[PDB]
């Protein structure tokens, strides 16, 4: 190509053409923990516009952006927060029972 | 190019009547040599090639070809 | 073959329960039971596989 420099975006591979001569040929992460999402193809982001949602998304809540490990953690945290809020309301009622 | 082992699918493709020509390629191989042959048709999306090993199957496929479809050898 | 732990053979025409065999002593056991049975296609052997 017109670019003669060794920029990492213009690296070349050696491929043996059928004619016998050698010719130059041009060559999903979790949103909470950052680990790569399993079951998702590691294709170019622009190439996902045609792949079916089945390959891009796993059959789970937060499946397309979480590894299901932090999903459990956040579900447990939400349940504990709700339980504490109920406990806090009970404490408030107990305090109001005297005033 | 694509390869399909469905004989009836190839027959339907030839029966489409919207293909100008087809080609049958004769080959030689051994495992006891055998006369391997290939059947190829031109599709709108991609070329379809059918692999046939038995001579009788190739003859039956050739017979099944409608007369309206021309078959250029090699 | 049934879940009662007993395999029974019935004549095609007469329908008599000519022969029987017990596979599991605990007929009421829910852990496992007779899954499938198949006769050997080859003749002159009379082998009945019982799963």
């Amino acid at each position: 190509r017109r670019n003669p420099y060794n920029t990492r975006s213009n690296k070349i591979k050696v491929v043996k053409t059928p004619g016998g001569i050698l010719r130059a040929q041009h060559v999903p992460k979790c949103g909470d923990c950052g680990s790569a999402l399993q079951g998702i193809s590691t294709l170019r982001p622009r190439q996902y516009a045609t792949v079916s949602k089945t390959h891009k998304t796993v059959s789970r809540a937060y499946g397309g952006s979480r590894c299901a490990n932090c999903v459990k953690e956040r579900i447990i945290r939400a349940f504990l927060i709700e339980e504490q809020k109920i406990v806090k309301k009970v404490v408030k009622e107990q305090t109001e029972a005297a005033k | 190019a694509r390869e399909i082992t469905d004989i009836k699918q190839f027959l339907e493709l030839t029966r489409r009547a919207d293909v100008k020509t087809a080609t049958v390629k004769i080959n030689k191989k051994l495992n006891k040599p055998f006369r391997q042959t290939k059947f190829k048709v031109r599709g709108s999306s991609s070329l379809y090639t059918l692999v046939i090993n038995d001579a009788g199957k190739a003859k039956k496929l050739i017979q099944s070809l409608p007369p309206t479809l021309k078959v250029n050898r090699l | 073959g049934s879940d009662d732990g007993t395999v029974r053979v019935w004549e095609i025409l007469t329908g008599r329960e000519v022969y029987r065999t017990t596979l599991i002593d605990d007929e009421e056991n829910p852990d496992y039971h007779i899954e499938c049975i198949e006769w050997n296609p080859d003749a002159n052997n009379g082998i009945l596989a019982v799963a």
Binding site: - | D6, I7, K8, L11, S64 | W10, I12
Partner: protein, 100 residues
Amino acid sequence: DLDLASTPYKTLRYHEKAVRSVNFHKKLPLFSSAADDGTIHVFHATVYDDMMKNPMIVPLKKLTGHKVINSLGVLDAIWHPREAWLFSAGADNTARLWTT
């Protein structure tokens, strides 16, 4: 069909419940399907050995007599090795044999 395409040649959906089993006839050109609804159906089916024609499958008769228990029906069914007879099995603790 092993030669038509990867997809089914024809899709049939008539049973009122899960289709437990379908068995081909060893000799005659017939086959029957079994479902949990307690109803057995028998279909004639011609299979050309080498002719480039699709198989002709048509229903023949709706067979009834099995009792549906626990949302289950004909657990298994097998054709006679040489005759047009169909054995049957169900959850009602009573196997049955069908004849013309």
